[PDB]
Amino acid sequence: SEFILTSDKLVWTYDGHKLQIEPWGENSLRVRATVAPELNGNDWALLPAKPSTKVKVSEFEDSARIVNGNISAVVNGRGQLSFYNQNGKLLLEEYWRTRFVAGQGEDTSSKYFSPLTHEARELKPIQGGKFELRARFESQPDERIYGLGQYQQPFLNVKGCTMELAQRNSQASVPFMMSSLGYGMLWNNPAIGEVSFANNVTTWMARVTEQLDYWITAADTPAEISQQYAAATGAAPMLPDYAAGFWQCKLRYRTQDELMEVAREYKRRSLPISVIVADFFHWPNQGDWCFDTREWPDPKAMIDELKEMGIELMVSIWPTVDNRTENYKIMKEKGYLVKAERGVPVTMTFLGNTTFFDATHPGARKYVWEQAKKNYHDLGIKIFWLDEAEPEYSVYDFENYRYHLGPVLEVGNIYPRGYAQAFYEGMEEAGQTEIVNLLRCAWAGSQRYGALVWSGDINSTFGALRNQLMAGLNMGIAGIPWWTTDIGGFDGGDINDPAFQELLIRWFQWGVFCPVTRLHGFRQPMEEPAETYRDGIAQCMTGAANEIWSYGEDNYAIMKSCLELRERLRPYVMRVMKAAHDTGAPVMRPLFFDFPDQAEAWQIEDQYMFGPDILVAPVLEAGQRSRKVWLPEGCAWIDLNTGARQNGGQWCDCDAPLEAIPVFIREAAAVQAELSIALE
Amino acid sequence: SEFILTSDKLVWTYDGHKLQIEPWGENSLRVRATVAPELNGNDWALLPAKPSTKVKVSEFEDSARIVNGNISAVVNGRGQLSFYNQNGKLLLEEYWRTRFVAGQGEDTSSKYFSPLTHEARELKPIQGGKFELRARFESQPDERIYGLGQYQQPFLNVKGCTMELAQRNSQASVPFMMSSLGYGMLWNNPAIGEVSFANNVTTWMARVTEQLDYWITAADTPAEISQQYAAATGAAPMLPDYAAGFWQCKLRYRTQDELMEVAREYKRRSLPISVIVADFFHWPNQGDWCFDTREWPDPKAMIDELKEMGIELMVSIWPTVDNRTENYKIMKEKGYLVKAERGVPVTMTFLGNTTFFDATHPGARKYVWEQAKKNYHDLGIKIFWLDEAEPEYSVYDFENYRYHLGPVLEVGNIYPRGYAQAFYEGMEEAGQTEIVNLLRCAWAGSQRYGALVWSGDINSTFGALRNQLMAGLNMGIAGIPWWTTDIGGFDGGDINDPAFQELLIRWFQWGVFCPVTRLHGFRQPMEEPAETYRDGIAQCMTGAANEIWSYGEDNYAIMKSCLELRERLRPYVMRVMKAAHDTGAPVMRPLFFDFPDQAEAWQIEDQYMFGPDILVAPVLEAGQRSRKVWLPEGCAWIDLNTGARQNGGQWCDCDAPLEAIPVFIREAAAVQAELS
Amino acid sequence: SEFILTSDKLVWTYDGHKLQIEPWGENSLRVRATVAPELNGNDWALLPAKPSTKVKVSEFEDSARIVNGNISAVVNGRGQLSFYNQNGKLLLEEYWRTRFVAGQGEDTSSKYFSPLTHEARELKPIQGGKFELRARFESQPDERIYGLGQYQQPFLNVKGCTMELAQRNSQASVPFMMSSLGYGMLWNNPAIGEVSFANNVTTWMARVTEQLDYWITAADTPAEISQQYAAATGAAPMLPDYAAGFWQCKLRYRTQDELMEVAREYKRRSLPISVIVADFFHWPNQGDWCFDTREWPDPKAMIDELKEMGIELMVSIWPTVDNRTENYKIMKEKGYLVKAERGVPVTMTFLGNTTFFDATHPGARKYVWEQAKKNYHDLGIKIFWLDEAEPEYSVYDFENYRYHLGPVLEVGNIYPRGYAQAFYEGMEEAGQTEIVNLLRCAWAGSQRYGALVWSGD
Numbered sequence A: 001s002e003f004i005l006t007s008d009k010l011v012w013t014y015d016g017h018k019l020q021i022e023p024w025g026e027n028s029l030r031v032r033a034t035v036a037p038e039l040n041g042n043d044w045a046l047l048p049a050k051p052s053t054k055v056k057v058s059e060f061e062d063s064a065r066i067v068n069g070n071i072s073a074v075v076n077g078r079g080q081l082s083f084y085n086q087n088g089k090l091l092l093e094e095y096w097r098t099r100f101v102a103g104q105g106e107d108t109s110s111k112y113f114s115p116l117t118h119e120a121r122e123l124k125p126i127q128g129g130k131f132e133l134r135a136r137f138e139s140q141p142d143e144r145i146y147g148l149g150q151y152q153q154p155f156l157n158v159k160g161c162t163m164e165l166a167q168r169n170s171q172a173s174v175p176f177m178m179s180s181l182g183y184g185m186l187w188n189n190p191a192i193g194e195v196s197f198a199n200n201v202t203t204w205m206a207r208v209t210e211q212l213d214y215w216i217t218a219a220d221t222p223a224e225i226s227q228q229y230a231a232a233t234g235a236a237p238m239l240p241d242y243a244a245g246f247w248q249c250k251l252r253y254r255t256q257d258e259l260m261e262v263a264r265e266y267k268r269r270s271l272p273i274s275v276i277v278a279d280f281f282h283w284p285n286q287g288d289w290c291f292d293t294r295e296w297p298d299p300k301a302m303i304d305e306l307k308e309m310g311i312e313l314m315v316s317i318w319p320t321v322d323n324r325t326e327n328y329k330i331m332k333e334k335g336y337l338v339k340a341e342r343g344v345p346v347t348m349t350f351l352g353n354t355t356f357f358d359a360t361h362p363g364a365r366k367y368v369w370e371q372a373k374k375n376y377h378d379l380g381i382k383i384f385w386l387d388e389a390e391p392e393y394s395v396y397d398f399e400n401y402r403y404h405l406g407p408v409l410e411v412g413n414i415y416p417r418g419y420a421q422a423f424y425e426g427m428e429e430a431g432q433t434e435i436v437n438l439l440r441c442a443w444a445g446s447q448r449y450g451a452l453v454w455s456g457d458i459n460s461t462f463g464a465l466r467n468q469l470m471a472g473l474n475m476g477i478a479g480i481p482w483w484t485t486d487i488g489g490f491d492g493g494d495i496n497d498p499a500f501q502e503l504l505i506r507w508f509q510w511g512v513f514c515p516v517t518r519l520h521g522f523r524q525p526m527e528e529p530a531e532t533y534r535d536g537i538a539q540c541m542t543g544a545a546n547e548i549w550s551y552g553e554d555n556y557a558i559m560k561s562c563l564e565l566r567e568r569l570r571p572y573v574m575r576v577m578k579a580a581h582d583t584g585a586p587v588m589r590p591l592f593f594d595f596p597d598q599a600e601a602w603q604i605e606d607q608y609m610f611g612p613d614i615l616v617a618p619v620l621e622a623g624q625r626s627r628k629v630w631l632p633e634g635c636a637w638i639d640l641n642t643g644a645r646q647n648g649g650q651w652c653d654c655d656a657p658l659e660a661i662p663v664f665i666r667e668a669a670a671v672q673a674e675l676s677i678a679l680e
Numbered sequence B: 001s002e003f004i005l006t007s008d009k010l011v012w013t014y015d016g017h018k019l020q021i022e023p024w025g026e027n028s029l030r031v032r033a034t035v036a037p038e039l040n041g042n043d044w045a046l047l048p049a050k051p052s053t054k055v056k057v058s059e060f061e062d063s064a065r066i067v068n069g070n071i072s073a074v075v076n077g078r079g080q081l082s083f084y085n086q087n088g089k090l091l092l093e094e095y096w097r098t099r100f101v102a103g104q105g106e107d108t109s110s111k112y113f114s115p116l117t118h119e120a121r122e123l124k125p126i127q128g129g130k131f132e133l134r135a136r137f138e139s140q141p142d143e144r145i146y147g148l149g150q151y152q153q154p155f156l157n158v159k160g161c162t163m164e165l166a167q168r169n170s171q172a173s174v175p176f177m178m179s180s181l182g183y184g185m186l187w188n189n190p191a192i193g194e195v196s197f198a199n200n201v202t203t204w205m206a207r208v209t210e211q212l213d214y215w216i217t218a219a220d221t222p223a224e225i226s227q228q229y230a231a232a233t234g235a236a237p238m239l240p241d242y243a244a245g246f247w248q249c250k251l252r253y254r255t256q257d258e259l260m261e262v263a264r265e266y267k268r269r270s271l272p273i274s275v276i277v278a279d280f281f282h283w284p285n286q287g288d289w290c291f292d293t294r295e296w297p298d299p300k301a302m303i304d305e306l307k308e309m310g311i312e313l314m315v316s317i318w319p320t321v322d323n324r325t326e327n328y329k330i331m332k333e334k335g336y337l338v339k340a341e342r343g344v345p346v347t348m349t350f351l352g353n354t355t356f357f358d359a360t361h362p363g364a365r366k367y368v369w370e371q372a373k374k375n376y377h378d379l380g381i382k383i384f385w386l387d388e389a390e391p392e393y394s395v396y397d398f399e400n401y402r403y404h405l406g407p408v409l410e411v412g413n414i415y416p417r418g419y420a421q422a423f424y425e426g427m428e429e430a431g432q433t434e435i436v437n438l439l440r441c442a443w444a445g446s447q448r449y450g451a452l453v454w455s456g457d458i459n460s461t462f463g464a465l466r467n468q469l470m471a472g473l474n475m476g477i478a479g480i481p482w483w484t485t486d487i488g489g490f491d492g493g494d495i496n497d498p499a500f501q502e503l504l505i506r507w508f509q510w511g512v513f514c515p516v517t518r519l520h521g522f523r524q525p526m527e528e529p530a531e532t533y534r535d536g537i538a539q540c541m542t543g544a545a546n547e548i549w550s551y552g553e554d555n556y557a558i559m560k561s562c563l564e565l566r567e568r569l570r571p572y573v574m575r576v577m578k579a580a581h582d583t584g585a586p587v588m589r590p591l592f593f594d595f596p597d598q599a600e601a602w603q604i605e606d607q608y609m610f611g612p613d614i615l616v617a618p619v620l621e622a623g624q625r626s627r628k629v630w631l632p633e634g635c636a637w638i639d640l641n642t643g644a645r646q647n648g649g650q651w652c653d654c655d656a657p658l659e660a661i662p663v664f665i666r667e668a669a670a671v672q673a674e675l676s
Numbered sequence C: 001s002e003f004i005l006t007s008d009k010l011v012w013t014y015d016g017h018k019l020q021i022e023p024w025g026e027n028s029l030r031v032r033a034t035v036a037p038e039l040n041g042n043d044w045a046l047l048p049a050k051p052s053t054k055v056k057v058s059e060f061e062d063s064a065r066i067v068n069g070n071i072s073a074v075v076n077g078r079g080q081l082s083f084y085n086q087n088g089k090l091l092l093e094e095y096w097r098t099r100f101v102a103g104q105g106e107d108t109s110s111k112y113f114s115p116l117t118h119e120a121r122e123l124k125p126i127q128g129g130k131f132e133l134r135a136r137f138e139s140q141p142d143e144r145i146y147g148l149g150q151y152q153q154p155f156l157n158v159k160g161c162t163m164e165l166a167q168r169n170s171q172a173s174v175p176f177m178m179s180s181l182g183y184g185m186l187w188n189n190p191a192i193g194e195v196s197f198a199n200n201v202t203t204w205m206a207r208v209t210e211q212l213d214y215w216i217t218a219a220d221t222p223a224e225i226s227q228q229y230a231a232a233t234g235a236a237p238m239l240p241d242y243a244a245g246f247w248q249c250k251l252r253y254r255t256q257d258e259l260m261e262v263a264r265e266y267k268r269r270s271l272p273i274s275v276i277v278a279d280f281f282h283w284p285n286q287g288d289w290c291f292d293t294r295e296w297p298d299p300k301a302m303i304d305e306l307k308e309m310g311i312e313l314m315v316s317i318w319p320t321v322d323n324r325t326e327n328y329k330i331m332k333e334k335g336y337l338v339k340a341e342r343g344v345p346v347t348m349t350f351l352g353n354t355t356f357f358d359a360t361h362p363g364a365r366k367y368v369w370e371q372a373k374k375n376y377h378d379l380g381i382k383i384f385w386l387d388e389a390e391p392e393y394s395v396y397d398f399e400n401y402r403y404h405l406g407p408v409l410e411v412g413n414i415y416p417r418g419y420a421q422a423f424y425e426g427m428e429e430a431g432q433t434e435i436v437n438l439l440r441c442a443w444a445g446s447q448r449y450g451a452l453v454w455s456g457d
């Protein structure tokens, strides 16, 4: 057992195991461990640390301590690590269950004493290869845990849940967690694996990795933890003003004329609309990244007319390259494609045999961007829909694929970040200052590349709606403030069905109070294409209509008033977006973000704060026409739908007719005067 | 998608996947699934089923259904399975998250619709080999889960916990679970893996296996579930009388004279003592399985004097075979040893380079038994301490070891069952009835081989005591009624330390109300052997004394009264042991076993029932001199220590002086008269 | 298909596969290939090359060519490589059997056209890991092949033989071959593997590696090839004069008295004797690296008398460290031991449970040297018997052991070179010139560390 200490770094070593703990921003430490000769140069999501104020390394009781403001790490003589805040409260301790550790007998008075033989930093060597990593920590009885990204499950607090650390359609692993004990932790490792916050033990796992790497931070409030995390992995940029308005989309406007008729119809009805969208397969083949001139005869004319109308066009980008295209040949020559480890060299079989571009290859990123620049951005398109961003392998056999940076098992989760990066850096280089792209997935730090994330191809049910609410709130805690969904969900909504229409309205009403308000879906009844193939290329179907007038008159009136409300909220939304850019605060956030000292704020999962001034209580059940709403203590609240003033610190039994979900405004906030509050 | 239905069997198939559901005892079904050409012949823990008269297989719309009494299974046209009780209530449903399944689009109105692509029955092919199995089930927000064996954790209800399906010192995987929703389930698969009862999904995993195999049972009460499980995997036999008395042990009586002096001191003071124990390294070398005559000059004379005193001798058995022994040579010739897949052919390095005998090899079982028969059983020893039963690899690299029945990844967890079987079958064939052996580990069905399990080499702390209460209760739920601990814990207790002495008293008081009352440990200050080596063989140390007079007179009086109390309890213990044999009920039970209709019985984890008539509320903290005790509704309760009558259905603040823990007797139960 | 050419380097690339060919000494080329982003910094046995002044790089038709004195490499537009001497004679040709390669159809008039689909440079990805390498070359009907090291087989010419690229007691993989066609080739890769010079195809194999790396040289005579190889991997030093005399040894002189009785009896009979040897287990325990004073009560007096007699003492060094020793404890603390990947942490069980010192770890080399220096070299011992140099695992499960430089599968064969290096560098640092140590095993370049190899048990 040997400490190698300096005035601002704590190293411990035994039998080739090196543990290194150091400052990494105010109130924060980075922890790395390896059994390789040295630590490698991989920083993954961590940006360079701003030098720390008042770091102190010391020795006591055969241990070493490193303090960095509000956090301290204690490594004992057996190499066992625990973290404390400035008040001496335990935040996080390693889980050890051994009788012999670091060449020493374990202390029999400790819960660490056990014949089971579990290590807290298990770097299990893979034969012929690298290491399978398990980092074990003790569970704590009181601990509530948030963040981790976007998971399809009805749990805000994920203590007791196990999350796959992998990217799949409708899932985003963004492995920053925030704990009710007053710390946050980033698992700074893009390897395929798992995090289980089991009641009996916390275990983070990487299938293949070179070393343990995580970042841990402490503060007295959630807001400070979020700010410290944004300083560590990057701030969201400022949202462009157009992105706070209404986004109209469906699967799919098949032609220029079809898309333009929808846009004109919105303007004819004097309805708000800021973005309209050309979904996938508007192109000749996958990997061409251009409009098919047969269905889209004059894209610049479309874009020019849309600009007169005050509407931005977004276009679908797919990361797939079909093996019959010119770009396949060139990208294959240059090694810009992902590779199958075994079997046929095809990563996806949707409407052709395609291979994903390698978003971890800087050359590939630049190649794909410059195709998009030439064929889209140069025409005035300022938003890209970066779909299939995981990427969506036809079969998720992560072991069978390899990237520029290594096997998908080792580096796979960073793919969506690189995909976002390709377009952000490219667009910034082309002179665009405010950049937002719609990403289906993300990793830690994706926020810095202007990633507006949406929750993918979920089904159209109340079950899904509930899952999306939890996922979006957890995404915000994981540092992704720009987040949205397909209003109505993606799959299964028949436009004539009363059950789906009710879901649509509830989801739309929630959508008004999401970071971005975006209507999209694959509506039934679907329509097969006229011809199944053209030039040997399989043709893409479309769903039914998905405009706000497509669901009858009564529903149109509700959705129209939702659009008008969203317009009135735009100034507030932009203030909250600025605060996200400035402070790392999420836009939609759990009640505990704004009211951390109130017990109920840590228990309630079916309410949230849309910025600091608006309390939202969505309706998550079919048929429900009332619900209970807790009003936080510390201010009075104005009921948006009735104008009644309610004191904080009580439960209200709120009416929830089909026409409105319960929403309350913080009394005397600037947003109160910006809204029209009717008296009923 | 194709159903193949008969009068008593449901089969579903698509793309080589075969799902087979059939009756397996009353109110029970066996579920199997494979992508191999056919199901194999491995039954593992399941005994032959008594034929069910009431089985009914039906087809309706696109689905098929099989009912066996109080359980039914429905399989839809997409091969997705859920279970219901006789009232039609959901017990358990598979977890599917796909857009396409069984050649069909998934229903978009169902929570099963998802692009994530998780199957409920994932048989993932291992390249060049067999399958990595994951069986996924939906979680339920109100589901509380018990059993699974013996885990070193402070949780009775294990909903939210993840348990490793592996055997290590102080852990036993016995993978039967009982749910508060009204079903029990056996994972009938000995593969290394894991069970995660996570809030978001339940996942059972097997690292290497040929097929999915589980057994599920339904009843309106826990008692019926326990009974149905015992019919599935085997009844505990009848406990022999002598096992209900006091078992005296320490690490370690180094000589015949040392052991005999302790027994003589117990008799000199007219104290109860039923079993005395010779711990490990009383032998010349590992794999000799005999007394070393230098320290044990006349074993027959020891056993005869102990018999005159009314005491049975138990002896340590280690499954290790040192490579310098004659038995290593012969066992190596016959192929009766465990094999390392890679590296030096050594499985443990404790006091020698040893290799474990293969408890899954029927020949090796017979060989080891016949050695123990010749050197011990023929002398009159009739209890064996089957230690290191996991077995305790120096390094738990399960992938690096192989048994007769296959790689340890595929079959490893059945080792302790085979180890118990070797001795139980051997002793039965030698004419012994009512067999009991002290096993350190178990698998499903170990109870049928007379396995008294103890919780291994835990530390001597109050934290450990708390874990042991939970583990023992969960072992009973998993069908292991004969269970015990080292009173005082194993490791770290200094006999002169007041703090340890307090723990010892609290643990002893609890041990009186355990299925077996057994004093053991490795007490400080330890003593190194005089000679480190003798004939090149590393010599084993000892701990300090561990007799009831070794901790002063005040503690002596307390433990003496504990032994006298245990003797008065013996007829009740034998009644509860017979009930365990007859009905599969545990001996130490969670409150919900006897009071399943009462909410508090499913919440309280620091009280339990010692049989149906005694409520026990252990003191689990240093310095504590009182505690809250919930008294179940439906009977009056008699305070064991005051004789006071208390009505059921209330919380009482109970006196808990150092000299007694709170214990209550069901009013008018036969044991009331027996105890005062 | 793309060539990236400079005046002294040929690079070809397609789909991330990079092939790099460059001069590496007179009449010699280095060949490397990888599918990683770039070539790594591992040179293994190759010393830095003296600059070649007349190197000529050209492109013609769809091909490219690099000439360096007596050798030239030609790479066609499909990335297929062949070597020629100054007379235009074919030396070595890659083995390809495909219908489609480097994005192009294969030529149907060539023996390379085949549905079999074998590549000459097969970097087969290991799932979650690195690469399994096979480098295939055409066999040639009258090629005779020599070198490769020390194999227990009655064949000087090894055309038609298959040699394991692994170290075992009585075997040494030193993977430099000399062909009768007039070239030499070093497989500059320490991975566990195989070289088969089969009549139908030549295949070099590496179980685990990051990249292909070999060195190839051409000349009109063997003597020139041997000279060019010594310039590439290092010259043997000058042998000390005592090493040409008679070395007397047995298993084993157990005591100081027994050894000295033999030495004196050689002198009493007026017989020549230059070296006498103390074999293994003259020490208290494995990893102590000192005389046991019970059997060897005054080592200084022994060495001084042998010096008067004109005799050098050599002593047995074992690389094993028994787990009861003080050096085990310290070497474990510092990470200076070889590690088992699975199972008991024991690499050899001969007369105790021992773990090998990691001869690929620079710190461990220095640690073991300094023990031998304190206990042997400071007393006047000038020769070390570096036994068990493979090292001799009780079980040769190469997949189950890992070194400082990586898994034994990737780097294992360089261990005996590091073991030699530890003592050579240490003795040189202590002021000794003309160093010779008795090594049981070797890799390419072991000669530069004064390695007198013997053929084992």
Ligand SMILES: O[C@@H]1[C@@H](O)[C@@H](O)OC[C@H]1O
Pocket: A250, A251, A279, A280, A387, A388, A440, A456, A457, A490, A520, A521, A522
């Ligand atoms: O949102 C959808 C996206 O997730 C993908 O499946 O491509 C079509 C889009 O409509």
Ligand SMILES: O[C@@H]1[C@@H](O)[C@@H](O)OC[C@H]1O
Pocket: B250, B251, B279, B280, B387, B388, B440, B456, B457, B490, B521, B522
């Ligand atoms: O209980 C102990 C057992 O678990 C093992 O370690 O052998 C010695 C016994 O005292």
